[PDB]
Each structure stands twice: as C-alpha cells, then as structure tokens.
C-alpha cells in the first residue's frame, strides 16, 4: 500500500519537473531523462525483503 502511494507522489513530481525544465529551456530529451531519474529515486527499495 505504502509503496503505491509513494509511486503516486513520485510520478506526479516527475511530470512537474518536466514542465519546470522546459519553462527553463532544456532539451525535450533532457526532460524525459529527468522524469525517468526522479521517479526512480523517489520509490523506496528493500522494504519487503
């Protein structure tokens, strides 16, 4: 359950970091590279083990 919520929070922030990057002039590609990295860094790893 928890993991689910966090994932929701993470996906949101990813899209946001996307609009911020383009309002500041990054390359269309750099914004997706950032979305992928941020969502990977917000979801915790190991909890169930």
Partner 1 sequence: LTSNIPEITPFLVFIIGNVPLPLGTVTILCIDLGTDMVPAISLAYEQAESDIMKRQPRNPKTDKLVNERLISMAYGQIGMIQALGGFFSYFVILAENGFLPMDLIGKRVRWDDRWISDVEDSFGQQWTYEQRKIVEFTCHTSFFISIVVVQWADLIICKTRRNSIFQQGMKNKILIFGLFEETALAAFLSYCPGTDVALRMYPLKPSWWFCAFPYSLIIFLYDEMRRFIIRRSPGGWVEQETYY
Ligand X SMILES: C=C(/C=C\C[C@@H](O)[C@@H](O)[C@H](O)C/C=C/C=C\[C@@H](O)C[C@@H]1O[C@H](C[C@@H](O)[C@H](O)C[C@H]2O[C@H]([C@H](O)[C@H](O)CC[C@H](O)/C=C/[C@H](C)[C@@H](O)C[C@]3(O)O[C@H](C[C@@H](O)CCCCCCC[C@@]45C[C@@H](C)C[C@@](C)(O4)[C@@H](C[C@@H](C)CCCCC[C@@H](O)[C@H](O)[C@H](O)[C@@H](O)[C@H](O)[C@H]4O[C@H](C[C@H](O)[C@H](O)/C(C)=C/[C@H](O)C[C@@H](C)[C@H](O)C(=O)N/C=C/C(=O)NCCCO)[C@H](O)[C@@H](O)[C@@H]4O)O5)[C@H](O)[C@@H](O)[C@H]3O)C[C@@H](O)[C@@H]2O)[C@@H](O)[C@H](O)[C@H]1O)CC[C@H](O)[C@@H](O)[C@H](O)[C@H](C)C[C@H]1O[C@H](/C=C\[C@@H](O)[C@H](O)C[C@@H]2C[C@@H]3C[C@H](O2)[C@@H](CC[C@H]2O[C@H](CN)C[C@H]2O)O3)[C@@H](O)[C@H](O)[C@H]1O
Binding span for Na ion by CB under 5 A among 3-11, 21-29, 30-38, 39-47: 39-47
Q: At how many degrees (to 10) do helices 28-42 and 2-23 cross?
A: 160
In the set 4, 5, 8, 28, which binds ligand X (CB under 6 A)?
Answer: 28
Greatest distance between any 2 Cα atoms in the chain: 42
47 binds Na ion (CB under 5 A): no
- Pick one of partner 1, Na ion, ligand X, none as the site partner of residue 2 (Cβ within 5 to 8 A by kind): partner 1
Instruction: Report how far residue 47's alpha carbon sits from residue 31's, in angstroms, rounded to the nearest whole number.
Output: 29
Annotated binding site for Mg(2+): 45
């Amino acid at each position: 359950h928890f993991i689910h919520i966090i994932t929701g929070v993470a996906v949101f922030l990813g899209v946001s970091f996307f609009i911020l990057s383009l309002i500041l002039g990054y390359s269309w590609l750099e914004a997706v590279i950032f979305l992928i990295g941020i969502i990977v860094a917000n979801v915790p790893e190991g909890l169930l083990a």
